[PDB]
């Protein structure tokens, strides 16, 4: 019921997956503790290679896998 998440600066954390959680809601608290926001990051699925996935991914399908979170490049937004 957990996902292993590799963070920038050689950090790591374990997140619990409740039924129906999106990746955003799943990693929200753990990133906030590190002082990070998910919408300012990119997330990858580690297989064998970094494959990109969206923050609206259903996290229940990723239980038991390893993820990697990277900072987005600092480019201005239209938001």
UniProtKB/Swiss-Prot annotation:
It is found in: Cytoplasm; Cell membrane; Mitochondrion; Nucleus. Belongs to the protein kinase superfamily. TKL Ser/Thr protein kinase family. RAF subfamily. The chain holds residues 56 to 138 of 648 of the full protein. Transmembrane segments: none annotated. It is linked to Noonan syndrome 5: A form of Noonan syndrome, a disease characterized by short stature, facial dysmorphic features such as hypertelorism, a downward eyeslant and low-set posteriorly rotated ears, and a high incidence of congenital heart defects and hypertrophic cardiomyopathy. Other features can include a short neck with webbing or redundancy of skin, deafness, motor delay, variable intellectual deficits, multiple skeletal defects, cryptorchidism, and bleeding diathesis. This is RAF proto-oncogene serine/threonine-protein kinase. Serine/threonine-protein kinase that acts as a regulatory link between the membrane-associated Ras GTPases and the MAPK/ERK cascade, and this critical regulatory link functions as a switch determining cell fate decisions including proliferation, differentiation, apoptosis, survival and oncogenic transformation. RAF1 activation initiates a mitogen-activated protein kinase (MAPK) cascade that comprises a sequential phosphorylation of the dual-specific MAPK kinases (MAP2K1/MEK1 and MAP2K2/MEK2) and the extracellular signal-regulated kinases (MAPK3/ERK1 and MAPK1/ERK2). Residues 1-72 form the RBD domain. In skeletal muscle, isoform 1 is more abundant than isoform 2. This modification leads to destabilization of the protein, possibly through proteasomal degradation. It comes from Homo sapiens (Human). Monomer. Homodimer. Heterodimerizes with BRAF and this heterodimer possesses a highly increased kinase activity compared to the respective homodimers or monomers. Heterodimerization is mitogen-regulated and enhanced by 14-3-3 proteins. MAPK1/ERK2 activation can induce a negative feedback that promotes the dissociation of the heterodimer. Forms a multiprotein complex with Ras (M-Ras/MRAS), SHOC2 and protein phosphatase 1 (PPP1CA, PPP1CB and PPP1CC). Interacts with LZTR1. Interacts with Ras proteins; the interaction is antagonized by RIN1. Weakly interacts with RIT1.
């Amino acid at each position: 019921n957990t996902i292993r998440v590799f963070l920038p600066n050689s950090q790591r954390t374990v997140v619990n997956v409740r039924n129906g959680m999106s990746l955003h809601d799943c990693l929200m608290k753990a990133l906030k503790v590190r002082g990070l926001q998910p919408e300012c990051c990119a997330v990858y699925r580690l297989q064998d290679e970094k494959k990109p996935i969206g923050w609206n991914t259903d996290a229940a399908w990723l239980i038991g896998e390893e993820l990697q979170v990277e900072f987005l490049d600092h480019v201005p937004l239209t938001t």
